[PDB]
Curated annotation (Swiss-Prot), chains A, B, C, D:
GO terms for cellular component: extracellular region. This is Streptavidin. Residues 3-122 form the Avidin-like domain. The lineage of its organism: Bacteria, Bacillati, Actinomycetota, Actinomycetes, Kitasatosporales. The keyword Secreted applies. It comes from the Bacteria.
Length: 122, 122, 122, 122
């Protein structure tokens, strides 16, 4: 699914996910969030299953963004975990965990969870 | 926290997380799971905040493993999202999302969630 | 939002959520899942904020179903946590955690996570 | 596990979970959080598997607290999903989702996730 995954994706928030899928299972690229303490692109890296089943199942993958770049630092990191579904209207359906650096006393409050769906159009 | 993070970590399941933290915010290394459809090491990649706050807060980070290697393929990927806490007994406290590739009809059933704590000893 | 919440809702899977919102903040009713090890209705109980903000924010709520009834027992329980959004096309947007009873050795594998959106029509 | 579950539990934060397990699978009681926008007891309700497997597996359960009482309203609700494990040192191991009522524009930011372990002593 190297061809399928590689390219520019957009989620329901208007965020922009630009990713290259390597033959070796690597995901590399940049993320631009439309919301939160973020601006411009952030480096991302991740992994996908480069030899998925051939039974109609999606392709498992994930990636991470640490929310620091040359412009801003939000002292947090999000990971997206999901699968790529090919075909007519390709999608990457994910759930994500956003952890902010906290003191021990506030750690119970450290992690947001949500879900993003990415498509090739937006 | 480049020095702090880099090295060998172990979680409560006996899994082994071997990671190098780069000056540029990169996480690279290998993961060996003690449970599940897995054996030997898998490539991981991720990101950490390379300029965290100086107020006692932890350092945000995350990484991804796609569960394919030269031995096995589980058609799944886990992402860990959490923070590194330095000091006397350093810890990386995470929550994780494990997504398996599924058909659309089974997608509701695609994602496990849990939490792992990593320490420098085990 | 007692009036708004009370009634029959349906999610994207075709499941049926029948709920009564009490003046005291109680949620009571029945759930019928369209997927998984389930058939017919299961008792649910839960809670909602009976005095929400008046600033356009949604109404926080949650409920639990244990997957045992007179027909089947799946030895599991799901909790939905989310908010009710009123207006033209009312919605209850949730994320859920489905925990299966496991042995200690399999506990890492005990919990599924996902998201369901409920509307008054389907 | 009616006998096992019923009683007073405490988590790692010092919160107090007081619960009665009914023969019909009901959970009823009160929760007192040691952290966050909360004070004194809040009503809880939930469900547990009243006929669990007899193979060493834990007992699935869940409950909800809406964070409104006679003293405070935080416009939020937490659901705990997990399992009760009996024996020498009984535990209820959970993961939780805390949803705050938000505007649509802030909904991506609505839900915290974490994990609490409850024991009979603290
Ligand atoms: Rh969705
Ligand atoms: Rh923990
Ligand atoms: Rh959605
Ligand atoms: Rh734990």
């Amino acid at each position: 699914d190297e061809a399928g995954i590689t390219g520019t994706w957009y989620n329901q928030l208007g965020s922009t996910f630009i990713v290259t899928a390597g033959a070796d299972g690597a995901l590399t690229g940049t993320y631009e969030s439309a919301v939160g303490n973020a601006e411009s692109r952030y480096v991302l890296t991740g992994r996908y299953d480069s030899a998925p089943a051939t039974d109609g199942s999606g392709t498992a993958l994930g990636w991470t963004v640490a929310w620091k770049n040359n412009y801003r630092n939000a002292h947090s990191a999000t990971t997206w975990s999901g699968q790529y579904v090919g075909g007519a209207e390709a999608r990457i359906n994910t759930q994500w965990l956003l952890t902010s650096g906290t003191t021990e006393a506030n750690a119970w409050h450290s992690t947001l969870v949500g879900h993003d769906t990415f498509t090739k159009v937006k």
